[PDB]
Design a binder for this molecule. Sequence first.
Ligand code: J40
Ligand code: CLR
Ligand code: CLR
Ligand code: YLX
Lengths: 336, 56, 285, 215
Amino acid sequence: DQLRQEAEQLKNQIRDARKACADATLSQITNNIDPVGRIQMRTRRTLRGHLAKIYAMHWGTDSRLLVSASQDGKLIIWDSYTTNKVHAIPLRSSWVMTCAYAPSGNYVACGGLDNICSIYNLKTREGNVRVSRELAGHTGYLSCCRFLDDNQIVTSSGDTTCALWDIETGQQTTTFTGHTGDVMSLSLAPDTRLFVSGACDASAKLWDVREGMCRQTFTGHESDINAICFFPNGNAFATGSDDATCRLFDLRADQELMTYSHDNIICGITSVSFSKSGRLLLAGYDDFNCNVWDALKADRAGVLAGHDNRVSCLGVTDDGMAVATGSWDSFLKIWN
Amino acid sequence: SIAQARKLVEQLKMEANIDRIKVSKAAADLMAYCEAHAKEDPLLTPVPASENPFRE
Amino acid sequence: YQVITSLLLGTLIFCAVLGNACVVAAIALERSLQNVANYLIGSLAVTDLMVSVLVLPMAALYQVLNKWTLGQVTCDLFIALDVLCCTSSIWHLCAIALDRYWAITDPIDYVNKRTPRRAAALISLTWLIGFLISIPPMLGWRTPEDRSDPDACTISKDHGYTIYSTFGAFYIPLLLMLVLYGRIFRAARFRIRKNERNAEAKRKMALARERKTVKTLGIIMGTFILCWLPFFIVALVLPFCESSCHMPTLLGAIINWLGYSNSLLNPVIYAYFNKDFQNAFKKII
Amino acid sequence: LSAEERAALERSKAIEKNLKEDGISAAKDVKLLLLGAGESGKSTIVKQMKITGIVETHFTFKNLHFRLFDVGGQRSERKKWIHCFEDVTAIIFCVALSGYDQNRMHESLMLFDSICNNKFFIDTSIILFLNKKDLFGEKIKKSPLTICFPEYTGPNTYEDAAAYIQAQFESKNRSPNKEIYCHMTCATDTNNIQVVFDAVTDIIIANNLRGCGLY
Ligand SMILES: C/C=C\C/C=C\C/C=C/C/C=C/CCCC(=O)O[C@H](COC(=O)CCCCCCCCCCCCC)COP(=O)(O)O[C@H]1[C@H](O)[C@@H](O)[C@H](OP(=O)(O)O)[C@@H](O)[C@H]1O
Ligand SMILES: CC(C)CCC[C@@H](C)[C@H]1CC[C@H]2[C@@H]3CC=C4C[C@@H](O)CC[C@]4(C)[C@H]3CC[C@]12C
Ligand SMILES: CC(C)CCC[C@@H](C)[C@H]1CC[C@H]2[C@@H]3CC=C4C[C@@H](O)CC[C@]4(C)[C@H]3CC[C@]12C
Ligand SMILES: O=C1CC2(CCCC2)CC(=O)N1CCCCN1CCN(c2ncccn2)CC1
């Protein structure tokens, strides 16, 4: 109908509005800042026991325990201080793509090519880990899952939708639609009232958990987005795509701020994360390496080499003491 | 198809009718948070081996 | 003269101990190189390191000084330590052939029965036969007049022990390897020989694969036979035909050291040529 | 050496023991990836070897454990999950010969080219299965093959027309260390699981010959 031309009008209006708000680039304002300098981090621990590629990890809230998921159908909980194994949960399906840790430390979740999110009760009255709840209803593979609290969980799948579940009953309360391609990542806000999702339509979207509607849409990338992560402030986030570039978007300014690219890098980004103060941006790559970026400068400050295969997962502790990188060569590494 | 097109227009309208601040203020508040919490960043400022829990 | 000989033999020892040790290192470091195949190559490298550190230097001493200035007791010890490792190195070469033969011709045993316990069992039998070959002439099997000239150090020339040592150390290994590697050749040729431009490309590839299969088996068997066969013919003929069979000293030294050179040549043939070891070495250095 | 910390190391050692045992028995099975169109005859083959995400079926045939994965129910971008099957022993592909008329065959040819040129499947062998041989017979008796392939020229017969399609599929392979084992499905014989067994046995001997340096 005429609706196509009306949509085109609104698209052009939005672009004009954001152009007015642009008065000075992040680089100009942060030019005076003294460079952070070279960063030298070194493997402190190496965790071994996985016999296949590791696809995900998630730190505990106490910055001591962590969970890892691997293609050999194992969910191992480690003790990063002493490299001890605390649990080893066998999965019914070995095609697992994501894992989570409850903010209390009482539950873990996993999912993958089977379109099911499975929740496991860690601390029970018998000391044996059993599957408490399996949540079904997605049409495509499960890409990511984050524990909102001890009772609610947010998941994203390949059916171009995200959902909010109620673990006690098992039915999804809210469904978030609007994405055009597969949703690949997800990140909750510090106050757990908003979250962002990156999809294969080269667009990120901000969602309201309570209302279930899309507030803002960000589109600067040229290919699918593999990773997303909120700034510690909660007013910005960073994206990683197959375009071999990272980008920082701000919610209030509603536009891109800075780009983290190098002509020597041609491989895509698999995972991104920030530091405690937000001054560092750590990103894993397909060239077997992790690159530290200066979030306020777009200048590299170090390289965490040491993995023999593709770095697939990456996470920084709540207290910011250490960073853990897992990879396709079945090895975890805590760097600090 | 018309229903889908209508949905798209309505969504774009909502996203267009929001309040946006100037990139200058946004960039300043990011720099200010980064500066303010620089002392509590173990990765930024390497921690004494005595207080380092992954070595001693 | 003494200088030149001491230098050349010294270089040989240095190169052998270097090469052998690097193989053992690469296996211990990398996790890609820790299969049953490379447990029989690393054991062979260890056995040839033992040859290069214990026997070879004291054999170079005897060559230069042309006298054994260590006493009769030390002579009998180093003779028995020469027959052990050299015999263990020849049976390691047949344990790698028996592993390859079992891998090629029985593909279900390869899947669901091949364990490192097999590697360990094979390694133990090589050393066992070494002892069983080396231990007799200390406890018996010794002609009375053998321990005579205090300025010499030679193995027993008893007619019975000569047959025992030669046949149990080289001749039985040789035949076993020829049989197994002929069978492997036949199996390989059978596997190899089972859009006109596309069809011609297939024919080309087949011919090139029926050439690689001959080069490889030529390299292996030629190296083994050329290194060890000349020594063991002389070690069998001379003890019997005592008179009218004077052995020139130069040719004897050449055949002895040609026999020792197999410990240098083994890591090159079995380790430095395959791709995965090269990749691990490049990763390390 | 505290009592508590020794109890922890004991629990860790017990965990490491079960992980080792599970990994030993998880390397004795042959993994296979089953591909092809949703309707291409996969149901009959799956039925033969069992006499909404990933369907797994496993069976034992002559002291060999097989692990078959069907990804027909995963309606997503293939590039985002195809690297999970990098280590499969072989790929089983099913093609409907009858569907030169209903083109389904052009779709199948396109899928075949993509999977056989993926960077993850450079050396993985393919076991092609051409289904519905008899129905093809009736079809070509009337409707000529040229409706699908203008380049085709020859007498319309069951032997000639089928051999043409087989060669058109085999052409896509542009790599050594990779063989396409084609089989026009013998109706309701166990011969179908003997073409999988013979193909798997042949790609284990060739791998072992490569390690020695004799292939
Ligand atoms: C007239 C017509 C035709 C005939 C004429 C010409 C053609 C043939 C001539 C006769 C052949 C002579 C020897 C040929 C060797 C040769 O070509 O070697 C190649 C080149 O590598 C290097 O050059 C690099 C190797 C470096 C080795 C280390 C060097 C240092 C050694 C000292 C150690 C101490 C210091 C480290 C590599 O090997 P390759 O081409 O010979 O082929 C195979 C080899 O034969 C198999 O044994 C091997 O299997 P393995 O048993 O597991 O090892 C296979 O993987 C494969 O490598
Ligand atoms: C220092 C000593 C031990 C070196 C020994 C050299 C050996 C390895 C040489 C000498 C003669 C050579 C062979 C001569 C003839 C051929 C035929 C050719 O189509 C393939 C290579 C092949 C089969 C060669 C393999 C290597 C070979 C056996
Ligand atoms: C395997 C490849 C590197 C070839 C190895 C060649 C070896 C066998 C050569 C290199 C130097 C040689 C020695 C050089 C000097 C002499 C003195 C002479 O009276 C013969 C014996 C003796 C002691 C030689 C024996 C053979 C020898 C050790
Ligand atoms: O007799 C001596 C005395 C010593 C040995 C070390 C100190 C003094 C110097 C020396 O060179 N030789 C050995 C001569 C070289 C030949 N070797 C080859 C290995 N052997 C063997 N292997 C299997 C079966 C039979 N014999 C023994 C003979």
